mmCIF file of all heavy atoms in Angstrom:
data_model
loop_
_atom_site.group_PDB
_atom_site.id
_atom_site.type_symbol
_atom_site.label_atom_id
_atom_site.label_comp_id
_atom_site.label_asym_id
_atom_site.label_seq_id
_atom_site.Cartn_x
_atom_site.Cartn_y
_atom_site.Cartn_z
ATOM 1 N N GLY A 1 3.558 10.589 1.719
ATOM 2 C CA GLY A 1 3.098 10.632 0.338
ATOM 3 C C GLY A 1 3.101 9.248 -0.309
ATOM 4 O O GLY A 1 2.131 8.870 -0.964
ATOM 5 N N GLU A 2 4.204 8.516 -0.100
ATOM 6 C CA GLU A 2 4.413 7.145 -0.555
ATOM 7 C C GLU A 2 3.394 6.189 0.089
ATOM 8 O O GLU A 2 2.825 5.307 -0.579
ATOM 9 C CB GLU A 2 5.883 6.785 -0.310
ATOM 10 C CG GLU A 2 6.211 5.303 -0.353
ATOM 11 C CD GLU A 2 6.770 4.811 -1.678
ATOM 12 O OE1 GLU A 2 7.803 5.368 -2.114
ATOM 13 O OE2 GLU A 2 6.171 3.881 -2.282
ATOM 14 N N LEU A 3 3.128 6.360 1.390
ATOM 15 C CA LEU A 3 2.153 5.478 1.999
ATOM 16 C C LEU A 3 0.764 5.765 1.422
ATOM 17 O O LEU A 3 -0.024 4.842 1.195
ATOM 18 C CB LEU A 3 2.145 5.701 3.510
ATOM 19 C CG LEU A 3 0.923 5.123 4.223
ATOM 20 C CD1 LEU A 3 1.008 3.611 4.289
ATOM 21 C CD2 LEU A 3 0.782 5.722 5.610
ATOM 22 N N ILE A 4 0.442 7.046 1.241
ATOM 23 C CA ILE A 4 -0.877 7.432 0.754
ATOM 24 C C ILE A 4 -1.100 6.887 -0.658
ATOM 25 O O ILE A 4 -2.170 6.375 -0.966
ATOM 26 C CB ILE A 4 -1.017 8.960 0.810
ATOM 27 C CG1 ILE A 4 -1.329 9.399 2.239
ATOM 28 C CG2 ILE A 4 -2.105 9.429 -0.147
ATOM 29 C CD1 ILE A 4 -0.836 10.770 2.600
ATOM 30 N N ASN A 5 -0.068 6.970 -1.501
ATOM 31 C CA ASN A 5 -0.139 6.429 -2.849
ATOM 32 C C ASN A 5 -0.392 4.929 -2.860
ATOM 33 O O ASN A 5 -1.164 4.489 -3.707
ATOM 34 C CB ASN A 5 1.086 6.735 -3.704
ATOM 35 C CG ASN A 5 1.105 8.175 -4.173
ATOM 36 O OD1 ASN A 5 0.143 8.929 -3.985
ATOM 37 N ND2 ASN A 5 2.207 8.573 -4.787
ATOM 38 N N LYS A 6 0.239 4.173 -1.940
ATOM 39 C CA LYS A 6 0.081 2.725 -1.874
ATOM 40 C C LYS A 6 -1.314 2.358 -1.392
ATOM 41 O O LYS A 6 -1.832 1.287 -1.722
ATOM 42 C CB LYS A 6 1.080 2.083 -0.912
ATOM 43 C CG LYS A 6 2.387 1.656 -1.545
ATOM 44 C CD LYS A 6 2.985 2.773 -2.344
ATOM 45 C CE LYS A 6 3.455 2.329 -3.712
ATOM 46 N NZ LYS A 6 4.828 1.773 -3.658
ATOM 47 N N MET A 7 -1.882 3.229 -0.559
ATOM 48 C CA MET A 7 -3.238 3.034 -0.074
ATOM 49 C C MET A 7 -4.235 3.264 -1.215
ATOM 50 O O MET A 7 -5.174 2.473 -1.383
ATOM 51 C CB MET A 7 -3.553 3.981 1.088
ATOM 52 C CG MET A 7 -5.018 3.986 1.510
ATOM 53 S SD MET A 7 -5.510 5.544 2.324
ATOM 54 C CE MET A 7 -5.621 6.708 0.964
ATOM 55 N N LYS A 8 -4.051 4.351 -1.983
ATOM 56 C CA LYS A 8 -4.941 4.618 -3.107
ATOM 57 C C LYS A 8 -4.988 3.389 -4.021
ATOM 58 O O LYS A 8 -6.066 2.983 -4.449
ATOM 59 C CB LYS A 8 -4.500 5.855 -3.892
ATOM 60 C CG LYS A 8 -4.930 7.202 -3.336
ATOM 61 C CD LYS A 8 -3.936 8.253 -3.816
ATOM 62 C CE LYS A 8 -4.480 9.658 -3.971
ATOM 63 N NZ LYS A 8 -5.094 10.133 -2.711
ATOM 64 N N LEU A 9 -3.818 2.773 -4.273
ATOM 65 C CA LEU A 9 -3.701 1.636 -5.176
ATOM 66 C C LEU A 9 -4.358 0.394 -4.575
ATOM 67 O O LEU A 9 -5.018 -0.359 -5.288
ATOM 68 C CB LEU A 9 -2.230 1.385 -5.519
ATOM 69 C CG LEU A 9 -1.590 2.364 -6.504
ATOM 70 C CD1 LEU A 9 -0.109 2.057 -6.687
ATOM 71 C CD2 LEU A 9 -2.310 2.377 -7.855
ATOM 72 N N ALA A 10 -4.176 0.175 -3.263
ATOM 73 C CA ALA A 10 -4.869 -0.931 -2.623
ATOM 74 C C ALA A 10 -6.388 -0.754 -2.735
ATOM 75 O O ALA A 10 -7.093 -1.745 -2.906
ATOM 76 C CB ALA A 10 -4.410 -1.136 -1.198
ATOM 77 N N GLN A 11 -6.879 0.494 -2.665
ATOM 78 C CA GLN A 11 -8.307 0.772 -2.748
ATOM 79 C C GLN A 11 -8.829 0.560 -4.167
ATOM 80 O O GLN A 11 -10.005 0.267 -4.347
ATOM 81 C CB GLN A 11 -8.595 2.244 -2.476
ATOM 82 C CG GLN A 11 -8.864 2.579 -1.022
ATOM 83 C CD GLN A 11 -8.773 4.080 -0.873
ATOM 84 O OE1 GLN A 11 -7.818 4.602 -0.309
ATOM 85 N NE2 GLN A 11 -9.736 4.793 -1.434
ATOM 86 N N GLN A 12 -7.971 0.780 -5.166
ATOM 87 C CA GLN A 12 -8.330 0.572 -6.557
ATOM 88 C C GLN A 12 -8.482 -0.921 -6.856
ATOM 89 O O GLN A 12 -9.433 -1.321 -7.517
ATOM 90 C CB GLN A 12 -7.268 1.175 -7.473
ATOM 91 C CG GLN A 12 -7.532 2.622 -7.853
ATOM 92 C CD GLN A 12 -6.560 3.024 -8.936
ATOM 93 O OE1 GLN A 12 -6.493 2.396 -9.992
ATOM 94 N NE2 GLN A 12 -5.779 4.063 -8.673
ATOM 95 N N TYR A 13 -7.544 -1.738 -6.371
ATOM 96 C CA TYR A 13 -7.502 -3.150 -6.710
ATOM 97 C C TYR A 13 -8.091 -3.986 -5.582
ATOM 98 O O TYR A 13 -7.676 -5.128 -5.374
ATOM 99 C CB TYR A 13 -6.074 -3.570 -7.059
ATOM 100 C CG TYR A 13 -5.553 -2.879 -8.290
ATOM 101 C CD1 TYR A 13 -5.203 -1.537 -8.262
ATOM 102 C CD2 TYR A 13 -5.452 -3.546 -9.498
ATOM 103 C CE1 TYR A 13 -4.726 -0.881 -9.385
ATOM 104 C CE2 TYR A 13 -4.967 -2.909 -10.631
ATOM 105 C CZ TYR A 13 -4.604 -1.573 -10.576
ATOM 106 O OH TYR A 13 -4.139 -0.939 -11.689
ATOM 107 N N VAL A 14 -9.052 -3.392 -4.865
ATOM 108 C CA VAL A 14 -9.818 -4.097 -3.853
ATOM 109 C C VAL A 14 -10.552 -5.246 -4.542
ATOM 110 O O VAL A 14 -10.945 -5.114 -5.701
ATOM 111 C CB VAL A 14 -10.789 -3.153 -3.099
ATOM 112 C CG1 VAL A 14 -11.705 -2.373 -4.044
ATOM 113 C CG2 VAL A 14 -11.596 -3.872 -2.013
ATOM 114 N N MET A 15 -10.704 -6.362 -3.814
ATOM 115 C CA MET A 15 -11.442 -7.538 -4.250
ATOM 116 C C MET A 15 -10.745 -8.150 -5.465
ATOM 117 O O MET A 15 -11.389 -8.757 -6.316
ATOM 118 C CB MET A 15 -12.917 -7.214 -4.556
ATOM 119 C CG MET A 15 -13.850 -8.431 -4.558
ATOM 120 S SD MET A 15 -14.426 -8.976 -2.911
ATOM 121 C CE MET A 15 -14.688 -10.731 -3.175
ATOM 122 N N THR A 16 -9.420 -7.977 -5.543
ATOM 123 C CA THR A 16 -8.629 -8.631 -6.579
ATOM 124 C C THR A 16 -7.394 -9.272 -5.953
ATOM 125 O O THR A 16 -7.288 -9.380 -4.730
ATOM 126 C CB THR A 16 -8.252 -7.683 -7.724
ATOM 127 O OG1 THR A 16 -7.047 -7.009 -7.360
ATOM 128 C CG2 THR A 16 -9.348 -6.697 -8.074
ATOM 129 N N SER A 17 -6.463 -9.697 -6.808
ATOM 130 C CA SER A 17 -5.263 -10.363 -6.329
ATOM 131 C C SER A 17 -4.070 -9.416 -6.399
ATOM 132 O O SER A 17 -2.944 -9.852 -6.215
ATOM 133 C CB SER A 17 -5.001 -11.624 -7.096
ATOM 134 O OG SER A 17 -4.830 -11.323 -8.474
ATOM 135 N N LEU A 18 -4.331 -8.135 -6.685
ATOM 136 C CA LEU A 18 -3.351 -7.078 -6.482
ATOM 137 C C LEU A 18 -3.605 -6.415 -5.135
ATOM 138 O O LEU A 18 -2.867 -5.520 -4.727
ATOM 139 C CB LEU A 18 -3.425 -6.048 -7.615
ATOM 140 C CG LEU A 18 -2.757 -6.463 -8.930
ATOM 141 C CD1 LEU A 18 -2.546 -5.267 -9.850
ATOM 142 C CD2 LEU A 18 -1.441 -7.185 -8.678
ATOM 143 N N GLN A 19 -4.666 -6.875 -4.469
ATOM 144 C CA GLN A 19 -5.008 -6.469 -3.122
ATOM 145 C C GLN A 19 -3.798 -6.646 -2.203
ATOM 146 O O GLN A 19 -3.230 -5.668 -1.729
ATOM 147 C CB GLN A 19 -6.152 -7.353 -2.620
ATOM 148 C CG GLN A 19 -6.750 -6.890 -1.302
ATOM 149 C CD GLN A 19 -7.491 -5.592 -1.505
ATOM 150 O OE1 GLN A 19 -8.711 -5.577 -1.636
ATOM 151 N NE2 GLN A 19 -6.757 -4.490 -1.560
ATOM 152 N N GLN A 20 -3.423 -7.905 -1.962
ATOM 153 C CA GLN A 20 -2.404 -8.274 -0.996
ATOM 154 C C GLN A 20 -1.101 -7.541 -1.292
ATOM 155 O O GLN A 20 -0.462 -7.039 -0.368
ATOM 156 C CB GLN A 20 -2.187 -9.788 -0.977
ATOM 157 C CG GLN A 20 -3.460 -10.581 -0.705
ATOM 158 C CD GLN A 20 -4.024 -10.359 0.680
ATOM 159 O OE1 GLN A 20 -4.984 -9.611 0.878
ATOM 160 N NE2 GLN A 20 -3.425 -11.019 1.657
ATOM 161 N N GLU A 21 -0.740 -7.480 -2.581
ATOM 162 C CA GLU A 21 0.493 -6.845 -3.011
ATOM 163 C C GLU A 21 0.523 -5.385 -2.570
ATOM 164 O O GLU A 21 1.552 -4.931 -2.079
ATOM 165 C CB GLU A 21 0.671 -6.912 -4.533
ATOM 166 C CG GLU A 21 1.894 -6.150 -5.057
ATOM 167 C CD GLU A 21 3.202 -6.488 -4.349
ATOM 168 O OE1 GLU A 21 3.260 -7.543 -3.689
ATOM 169 O OE2 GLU A 21 4.158 -5.689 -4.431
ATOM 170 N N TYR A 22 -0.583 -4.659 -2.807
ATOM 171 C CA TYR A 22 -0.652 -3.227 -2.557
ATOM 172 C C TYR A 22 -0.676 -2.954 -1.060
ATOM 173 O O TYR A 22 -0.077 -1.984 -0.614
ATOM 174 C CB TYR A 22 -1.811 -2.566 -3.306
ATOM 175 C CG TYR A 22 -1.426 -2.278 -4.727
ATOM 176 C CD1 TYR A 22 -2.150 -2.800 -5.787
ATOM 177 C CD2 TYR A 22 -0.283 -1.540 -5.006
ATOM 178 C CE1 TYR A 22 -1.761 -2.567 -7.097
ATOM 179 C CE2 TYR A 22 0.119 -1.302 -6.308
ATOM 180 C CZ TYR A 22 -0.625 -1.816 -7.360
ATOM 181 O OH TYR A 22 -0.239 -1.587 -8.652
ATOM 182 N N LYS A 23 -1.375 -3.833 -0.332
ATOM 183 C CA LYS A 23 -1.449 -3.796 1.116
ATOM 184 C C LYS A 23 -0.066 -4.038 1.719
ATOM 185 O O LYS A 23 0.248 -3.418 2.727
ATOM 186 C CB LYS A 23 -2.513 -4.763 1.647
ATOM 187 C CG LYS A 23 -3.874 -4.109 1.867
ATOM 188 C CD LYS A 23 -5.105 -5.009 1.747
ATOM 189 C CE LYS A 23 -5.304 -5.916 2.947
ATOM 190 N NZ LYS A 23 -6.682 -5.874 3.500
ATOM 191 N N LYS A 24 0.737 -4.922 1.102
ATOM 192 C CA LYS A 24 2.083 -5.199 1.578
ATOM 193 C C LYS A 24 2.960 -3.977 1.307
ATOM 194 O O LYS A 24 3.931 -3.737 2.017
ATOM 195 C CB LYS A 24 2.688 -6.465 0.954
ATOM 196 C CG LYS A 24 2.131 -7.785 1.473
ATOM 197 C CD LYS A 24 2.181 -8.923 0.460
ATOM 198 C CE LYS A 24 1.067 -9.933 0.676
ATOM 199 N NZ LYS A 24 1.512 -11.327 0.441
ATOM 200 N N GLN A 25 2.594 -3.183 0.297
ATOM 201 C CA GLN A 25 3.396 -2.023 -0.056
ATOM 202 C C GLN A 25 3.064 -0.883 0.905
ATOM 203 O O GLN A 25 3.914 -0.066 1.235
ATOM 204 C CB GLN A 25 3.187 -1.624 -1.521
ATOM 205 C CG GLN A 25 3.976 -2.485 -2.493
ATOM 206 C CD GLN A 25 3.722 -2.169 -3.951
ATOM 207 O OE1 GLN A 25 3.270 -1.083 -4.317
ATOM 208 N NE2 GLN A 25 4.017 -3.136 -4.802
ATOM 209 N N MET A 26 1.812 -0.850 1.352
ATOM 210 C CA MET A 26 1.415 0.097 2.362
ATOM 211 C C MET A 26 2.244 -0.133 3.617
ATOM 212 O O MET A 26 2.823 0.815 4.144
ATOM 213 C CB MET A 26 -0.056 -0.099 2.667
ATOM 214 C CG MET A 26 -0.931 0.710 1.752
ATOM 215 S SD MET A 26 -2.642 0.366 2.196
ATOM 216 C CE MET A 26 -2.700 0.911 3.895
ATOM 217 N N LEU A 27 2.325 -1.398 4.038
ATOM 218 C CA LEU A 27 3.066 -1.817 5.229
ATOM 219 C C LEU A 27 4.509 -1.332 5.177
ATOM 220 O O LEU A 27 5.004 -0.692 6.108
ATOM 221 C CB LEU A 27 3.015 -3.345 5.362
ATOM 222 C CG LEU A 27 2.030 -3.903 6.396
ATOM 223 C CD1 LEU A 27 2.684 -4.026 7.768
ATOM 224 C CD2 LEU A 27 0.756 -3.070 6.486
ATOM 225 N N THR A 28 5.162 -1.629 4.057
ATOM 226 C CA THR A 28 6.539 -1.233 3.852
ATOM 227 C C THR A 28 6.664 0.266 4.048
ATOM 228 O O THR A 28 7.557 0.701 4.770
ATOM 229 C CB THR A 28 7.010 -1.693 2.472
ATOM 230 O OG1 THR A 28 6.866 -3.106 2.591
ATOM 231 C CG2 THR A 28 8.451 -1.364 2.159
ATOM 232 N N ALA A 29 5.756 1.024 3.410
ATOM 233 C CA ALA A 29 5.808 2.472 3.443
ATOM 234 C C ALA A 29 5.538 2.956 4.874
ATOM 235 O O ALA A 29 6.253 3.828 5.355
ATOM 236 C CB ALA A 29 4.877 3.083 2.402
ATOM 237 N N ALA A 30 4.565 2.360 5.576
ATOM 238 C CA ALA A 30 4.390 2.729 6.976
ATOM 239 C C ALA A 30 5.653 2.392 7.776
ATOM 240 O O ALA A 30 6.079 3.187 8.610
ATOM 241 C CB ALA A 30 3.169 2.078 7.576
ATOM 242 N N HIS A 31 6.267 1.225 7.509
ATOM 243 C CA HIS A 31 7.456 0.831 8.250
ATOM 244 C C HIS A 31 8.574 1.849 8.059
ATOM 245 O O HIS A 31 9.270 2.150 9.022
ATOM 246 C CB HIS A 31 7.915 -0.593 7.911
ATOM 247 C CG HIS A 31 8.897 -1.144 8.899
ATOM 248 N ND1 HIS A 31 9.176 -2.490 8.997
ATOM 249 C CD2 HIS A 31 9.686 -0.542 9.827
ATOM 250 C CE1 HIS A 31 10.082 -2.690 9.941
ATOM 251 N NE2 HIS A 31 10.403 -1.515 10.477
ATOM 252 N N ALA A 32 8.727 2.372 6.824
ATOM 253 C CA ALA A 32 9.746 3.374 6.514
ATOM 254 C C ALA A 32 9.482 4.642 7.323
ATOM 255 O O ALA A 32 10.403 5.220 7.927
ATOM 256 C CB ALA A 32 9.799 3.695 5.028
ATOM 257 N N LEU A 33 8.203 5.044 7.346
ATOM 258 C CA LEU A 33 7.790 6.234 8.077
ATOM 259 C C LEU A 33 8.166 6.106 9.557
ATOM 260 O O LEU A 33 8.734 7.031 10.104
ATOM 261 C CB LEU A 33 6.295 6.420 7.844
ATOM 262 C CG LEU A 33 5.688 7.715 8.353
ATOM 263 C CD1 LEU A 33 6.547 8.903 7.949
ATOM 264 C CD2 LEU A 33 4.284 7.867 7.807
ATOM 265 N N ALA A 34 7.905 4.957 10.191
ATOM 266 C CA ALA A 34 8.273 4.763 11.591
ATOM 267 C C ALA A 34 9.785 4.890 11.764
ATOM 268 O O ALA A 34 10.264 5.570 12.665
ATOM 269 C CB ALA A 34 7.804 3.419 12.082
ATOM 270 N N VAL A 35 10.537 4.234 10.881
ATOM 271 C CA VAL A 35 11.991 4.245 10.973
ATOM 272 C C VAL A 35 12.517 5.678 10.860
ATOM 273 O O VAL A 35 13.382 6.083 11.622
ATOM 274 C CB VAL A 35 12.646 3.258 9.985
ATOM 275 C CG1 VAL A 35 14.155 3.418 9.963
ATOM 276 C CG2 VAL A 35 12.321 1.833 10.408
ATOM 277 N N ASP A 36 11.952 6.455 9.936
ATOM 278 C CA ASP A 36 12.388 7.827 9.697
ATOM 279 C C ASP A 36 11.978 8.748 10.849
ATOM 280 O O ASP A 36 12.686 9.706 11.172
ATOM 281 C CB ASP A 36 11.949 8.317 8.308
ATOM 282 C CG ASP A 36 12.616 7.503 7.211
ATOM 283 O OD1 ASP A 36 13.699 6.940 7.485
ATOM 284 O OD2 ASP A 36 12.038 7.398 6.113
ATOM 285 N N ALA A 37 10.840 8.455 11.475
ATOM 286 C CA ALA A 37 10.463 9.203 12.659
ATOM 287 C C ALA A 37 11.535 9.053 13.739
ATOM 288 O O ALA A 37 11.987 10.042 14.309
ATOM 289 C CB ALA A 37 9.114 8.739 13.113
#
């Protein structure tokens, strides 16, 4: 759910400078998912 939310936000702020930030948040959330798996 957390990863999906971070993706929605990265898609909203595409072609901006909140791009990288949101993409980095996706990564974190995917990393958490792997760890929890």
Side-chain angles (χ1 to χ4, degrees):
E2 164 98 57
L3 164 73
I4 281 151
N5 285 352
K6 269 51 227 275
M7 171 205 75
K8 278 155 151 56
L9 285 176
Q11 269 166 253
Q12 270 190 57
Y13 296 73
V14 54
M15 200 82 208
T16 86
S17 60
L18 282 195
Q19 189 69 99
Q20 304 294 101
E21 175 51 18
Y22 278 122
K23 266 152 76 130
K24 286 151 209 218
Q25 280 176 21
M26 272 179 61
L27 258 271
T28 299
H31 195 163
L33 188 47
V35 172
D36 296 335

